[PDB]
Amino acid sequence: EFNILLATDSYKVTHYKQYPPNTSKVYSYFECREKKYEETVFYGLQYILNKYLKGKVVTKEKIQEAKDVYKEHFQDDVFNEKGWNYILEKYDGHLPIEIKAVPEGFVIPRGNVLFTVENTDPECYWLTNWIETILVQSWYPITVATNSREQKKILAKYLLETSGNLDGLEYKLHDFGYRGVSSQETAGIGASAHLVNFKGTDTVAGLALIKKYYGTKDPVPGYSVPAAEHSTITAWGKDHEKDAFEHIVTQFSSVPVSVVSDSYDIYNACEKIWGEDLRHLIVSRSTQAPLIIRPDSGNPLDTVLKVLEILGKKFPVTENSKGYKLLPPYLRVIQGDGVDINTLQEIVEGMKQKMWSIENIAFGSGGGLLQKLTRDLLNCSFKCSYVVTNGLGINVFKDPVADPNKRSKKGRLSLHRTPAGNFVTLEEGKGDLEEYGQDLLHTVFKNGKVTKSYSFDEIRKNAQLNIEL
Amino acid sequence: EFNILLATDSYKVTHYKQYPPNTSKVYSYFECREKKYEETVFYGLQYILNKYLKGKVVTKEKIQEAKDVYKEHFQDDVFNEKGWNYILEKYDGHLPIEIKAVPEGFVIPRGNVLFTVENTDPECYWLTNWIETILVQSWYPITVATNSREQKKILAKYLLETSGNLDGLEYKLHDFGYRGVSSQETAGIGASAHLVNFKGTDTVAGLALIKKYYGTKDPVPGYSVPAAEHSTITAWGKDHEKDAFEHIVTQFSSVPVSVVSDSYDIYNACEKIWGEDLRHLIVSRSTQAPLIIRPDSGNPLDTVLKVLEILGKKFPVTENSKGYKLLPPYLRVIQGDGVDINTLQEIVEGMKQKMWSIENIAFGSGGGLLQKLTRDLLNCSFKCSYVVTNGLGINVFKDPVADPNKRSKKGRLSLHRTPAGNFVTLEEGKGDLEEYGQDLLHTVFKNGKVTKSYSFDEIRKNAQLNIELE
Numbered sequence: 001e002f003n004i005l006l007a008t009d010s011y012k013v014t015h016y017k018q019y020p021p022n023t024s025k026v027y028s029y030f031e032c033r034e035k036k037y038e039e040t041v042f043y044g045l046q047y048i049l050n051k052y053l054k055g056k057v058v059t060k061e062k063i064q065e066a067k068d069v070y071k072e073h074f075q076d077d078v079f080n081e082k083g084w085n086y087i088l089e090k091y092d093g094h095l096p097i098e099i100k101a102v103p104e105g106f107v108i109p110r111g112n113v114l115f116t117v118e119n120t121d122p123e124c125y126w127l128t129n130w131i132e133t134i135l136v137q138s139w140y141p142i143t144v145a146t147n148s149r150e151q152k153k154i155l156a157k158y159l160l161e162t163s164g165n166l167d168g169l170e171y172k173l174h175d176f177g178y179r180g181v182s183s184q185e186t187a188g189i190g191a192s193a194h195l196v197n198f199k200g201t202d203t204v205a206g207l208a209l210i211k212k213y214y215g216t217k218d219p220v221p222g223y224s225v226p227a228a229e230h231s232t233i234t235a236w237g238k239d240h241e242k243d244a245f246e247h248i249v250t251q252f253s254s255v256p257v258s259v260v261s262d263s264y265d266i267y268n269a270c271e272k273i274w275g276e277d278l279r280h281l282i283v284s285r286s287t288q289a290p291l292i293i294r295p296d297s298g299n300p301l302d303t304v305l306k307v308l309e310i311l312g313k314k315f316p317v318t319e320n321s322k323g324y325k326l327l328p329p330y331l332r333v334i335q336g337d338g339v340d341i342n343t344l345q346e347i348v349e350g351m352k353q354k355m356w357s358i359e360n361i362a363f364g365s366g367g368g369l370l371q372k373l374t375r376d377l378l379n380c381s382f383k384c385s386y387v388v389t390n391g392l393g394i395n396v397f398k399d400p401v402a403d404p405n406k407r408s409k410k411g412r413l414s415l416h417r418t419p420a421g422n423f424v425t426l427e428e429g430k431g432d433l434e435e436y437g438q439d440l441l442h443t444v445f446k447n448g449k450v451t452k453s454y455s456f457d458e459i460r461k462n463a464q465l466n467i468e469l
Numbered sequence: 470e471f472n473i474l475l476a477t478d479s480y481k482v483t484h485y486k487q488y489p490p491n492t493s494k495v496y497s498y499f500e501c502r503e504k505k506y507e508e509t510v511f512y513g514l515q516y517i518l519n520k521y522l523k524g525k526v527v528t529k530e531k532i533q534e535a536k537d538v539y540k541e542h543f544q545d546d547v548f549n550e551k552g553w554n555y556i557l558e559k560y561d562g563h564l565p566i567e568i569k570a571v572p573e574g575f576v577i578p579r580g581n582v583l584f585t586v587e588n589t590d591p592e593c594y595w596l597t598n599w600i601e602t603i604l605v606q607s608w609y610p611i612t613v614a615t616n617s618r619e620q621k622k623i624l625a626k627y628l629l630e631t632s633g634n635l636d637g638l639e640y641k642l643h644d645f646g647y648r649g650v651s652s653q654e655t656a657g658i659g660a661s662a663h664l665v666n667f668k669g670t671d672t673v674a675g676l677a678l679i680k681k682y683y684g685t686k687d688p689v690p691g692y693s694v695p696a697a698e699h700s701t702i703t704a705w706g707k708d709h710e711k712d713a714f715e716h717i718v719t720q721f722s723s724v725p726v727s728v729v730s731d732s733y734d735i736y737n738a739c740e741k742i743w744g745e746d747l748r749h750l751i752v753s754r755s756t757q758a759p760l761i762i763r764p765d766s767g768n769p770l771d772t773v774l775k776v777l778e779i780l781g782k783k784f785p786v787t788e789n790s791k792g793y794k795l796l797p798p799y800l801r802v803i804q805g806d807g808v809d810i811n812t813l814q815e816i817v818e819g820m821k822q823k824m825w826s827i828e829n830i831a832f833g834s835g836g837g838l839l840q841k842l843t844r845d846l847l848n849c850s851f852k853c854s855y856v857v858t859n860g861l862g863i864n865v866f867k868d869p870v871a872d873p874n875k876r877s878k879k880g881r882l883s884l885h886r887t888p889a890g891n892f893v894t895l896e897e898g899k900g901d902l903e904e905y906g907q908d909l910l911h912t913v914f915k916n917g918k919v920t921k922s923y924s925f926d927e928i929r930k931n932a933q934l935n936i937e938l939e
């Protein structure tokens with residue numbers, strides 16, 4: 001089983017001896033510090049609260065386990081057994097902590113308080129920052145959700161421009177990232193964050209996470225269709241690629257099907273195999289069951305353009321009301337290699353310059369979507385801003401001489417709407433003056449209980465783009 | 470409850486219908502495909518085999534769960550209920566798969582077969598690639614271990630050059646990455662991979678993973694010491710940084726202690742607080758209990774060099790036998806901000822140019838060590854190379870016209886020692902010709918059972934640097 005006493009950075013085990021004597025309160029906050037990605041989607045804390053922080057998280061056995069581990073790890077007895085004992089005895093092992101947070105799905109500009117943490121019992125002043133490590137991992141679903149939303153903005157802009165509407169936008173970026181992330185747990189968290197913005201995923205782990213921790217009215221939050229991989233093509237033998245294609249599209253004749261087409265020669269496959277030998281099997285398909293051709297190698301922009309060029313000459317292309325070229329409805333393309341936020345932009349802009357509608361294409365992204373992200377992207381950070389020592393509150397902060405970007409906020413914080421309807425974080429307990437309407441932070445956790453929860457439907461509503469509003 | 474029927478890429482649910490009819494065997498392999506990182510440390514498969522693949526992994530309940538999920542996810546019944554039920558009924562839910570692998574800890578040049586997978590029952594031809602997704606996640610511990618070892622090579626070169634030995638090498642790169650990875654599970658996996666090469670870690674999750682899945686003779690594989698964070702300094706108030714410093718070093722007077730010193734002004738902290746006001750509390754400390762000063766902001770190289778110059782004028786510096794400057798034994802530095810393999814190289818070279826021994830310094834790395842890595846780095850990839858259809862074996866491969874780097878290997882594979890003692894991968898079943906001696910892969914998994922495994926001590930031995938060996 002998971003042991004919260006072993007789920008912190010080692011050095012934090014020693015911090016109870018380092019704070020000022022007579023400290024009864026340590027109050028800390030999380031922000032995506034201002035330093036590109038001007039606003040972030042707050043998502044993922046509810047998962048952490050439920051899986052790791054709520055209920056009886058301290059037991060006699062867990063305390064002894066930690067004591068034994070830290071004895072060897074530090075070669076010294078430094079572990080605060082007395083402090084953990086107190087929580088076990090007084091609170092039946094529930095954490096005396098209060099966390100207040102902005103609603104999940106909320107889109108907030110950089111440099112604003114997103115959640116705060118403080119101890120509710122003076123004996124547990126040390127506990128606030130014990131749980132920094134576990135809480136800071138919220139950086140990941142925040143960053144995946146944010147980066148996914150930024151790609152949706154790019155897709156929406158170009159889809160609207162080239163088609164006149166946003167039909168199909170929520171299926172334009174498919175999660176291919178299950179194999180490319182660092183763990184099973186990561187896969188679930190990351191896939192769920194992408195699903196805040198889109199509905200197409202192959203990362204099955206995301207579905208179970210959403211069902212367990214968030215919930216949706218619909219049976220599932222994400223969908224897929226039958227699709228080939230290189231192995232189901234190559235297994236037929238080099239000389240039988242056409243037989244593989246024919247078998248697969250016939251097996252899946254009445255649903256959408258994606259067929260990876262670059263095993264040997266993507267251009268030959270498009271022009272000769274799909275475009276001639278098997279054309280009769282494609283032009284007969286329903287609009288609700290297109291063939292989706294999938295290139296998977298070469299320069300992503302150059303390959304997409306060449307594939308469209310080939311297909312446009314073998315299949316009947318129309319010109320939409322915006323003046324952009326459109327493949328027949330039984331034929332589409334998905335580019336699922338080398339896609340990240342930067343290359344996505346390059347591809348849709350290249351398509352627009354060549355007069356191809358974004359209606360023609362969808363994207364798959366794996367490592368770019370779920371793995372190629374760090375805590376530095378949005379500067380997700382947790383800092384102490386207020387302590388009470390000898391009954392007096394003190395506003396505290398860091399402000400390193402050589403890096404003003406690392407200065408932290410001072411005092412008790414609150415988040416408010418400005419008169420123009422934007423966001424502002426008030427420092428130094430100024431929220432108490434009541435000049436800025438209600439605090440947007442809500443208590444979500446208190447003394448071992450989750451006190452406020454959001455459904456996945458609510459989160460999706462909060463995270464909507466302006467364009468779709 | 471983890472459910473292997475829900476632990477694959479969605480599209481793989483539909484693949485059993487796409488293979489050629491009457492296919493009885495699918496054989497696939499994993500490599501770090503050849504495209505800075507010329508050799509890789511193979512590590513992490515044993516964790517995956519034990520946690521996720523071994524024993525009864527299929528139950529009636531798990532089949533029903535998967536059936537219900539995929540029905541909604543595909544809006545259709547496409548899920549191979551019959552195929553999974555066959556495994557349940559015939560093998561008590563144990564996977565009819567055989568996996569052969571190179572020993573864990575082995576250091577192997579890019580483009581070699583690292584492991585192979587095939588089904589052991591013709592009915593389960595579809596199972597080989599079902600588990601691609603979960604096995605390909607081995608990229609992560611491989612890549613962490615490899616990148617960590619590459620940093621160790623850099624540290625060894627400069628430590629040897631500036632000091633004449635490698636004392637302390639295994640504590641030169643400390644894992645600070647627990648908060649900066651994407652999940653608790655990732656933290657344990659990544660931290661364990663770093664511990665293949667080093668012994669200093671704050672990512673506690675790695676200890677329990679190693680103990681459970683690998684094992685060591687020592688009670689724990691990794692160690693740490695008391696250390697401050699910004700909150701334990703700043704909580705004292707801006708005008709009381711000296712009081713914080715004094716309290717902390719007095720609390721930890723007889724063990725090593727690291728104190729973050731850049732809350733307000735690192736240069737003032739070093740020159741005036743440590744170098745003057747509290748100097749008497751530092752020069753009194755044991756060699757076994759140094760103050761370790763931690764800067765955490767600014768240009769990493771410029772800041773390290775300036776901190777060292779400041780301390781060198783406030784404390785007695787010696788010149789070691791190699792001609793490099795050395796702080797007294799009660800005083801050291803750790804640079805734990807902005808460290809990745811690139812900036813590490815830059816810092817130690819900069820120190821060498823300014824005649825400072827690498828003995829003076831250690832590094833902490835967080836996101837750079839455990840998170841800022843992708844499957845692309847070593848091109849970790851799983852591909853089908855051999856199938857049997859209608860009783861005929863076929864050597865299969867991809868070879869995309871626009872990217873020769875993505876060409877995959879053909880046929881049955883084996884790994885061998887060359888006459889010069891290097892590794893070579895033989896394709897097309899040619900290992901059977903016996904011109905290259907025995908296959909170096911070992912069967913590690915067969916029909917639900919782990920059949921070969923390695924202790925963490927063995928893995929560490931396999932992963933040693935040549936310079937450590939010599």
Ligand SMILES: CC(C)(C)c1ccc(S(=O)(=O)NCc2ccc(C(=O)Nc3cccnc3)cc2)cc1
Nearest residue numbers: 171174176200202223224225227256258362478480
């Ligand atoms: C559900 C609905 C019918 C609306 C639909 C959703 C999504 C698409 S799509 O074209 O955006 N994506 C379908 C798809 C699914 C999986 C794969 C695929 O190749 N997945 C995969 C997974 C992991 C690694 N590599 C590839 C390709 C296309 C089409 C229709």
Ligand SMILES: CC(C)(C)c1ccc(S(=O)(=O)NCc2ccc(C(=O)Nc3cccnc3)cc2)cc1
Nearest residue numbers: 009011640643645669671692693694696727761831
């Ligand atoms: C165990 C032994 C006595 C040999 C030893 C090991 C390692 C060092 S070290 O100086 O390489 N590292 C000690 C250390 C530990 C933790 C921190 C620290 O600040 N950790 C931390 C963790 C997470 C985030 N940020 C910082 C700093 C120095 C010194 C002695």
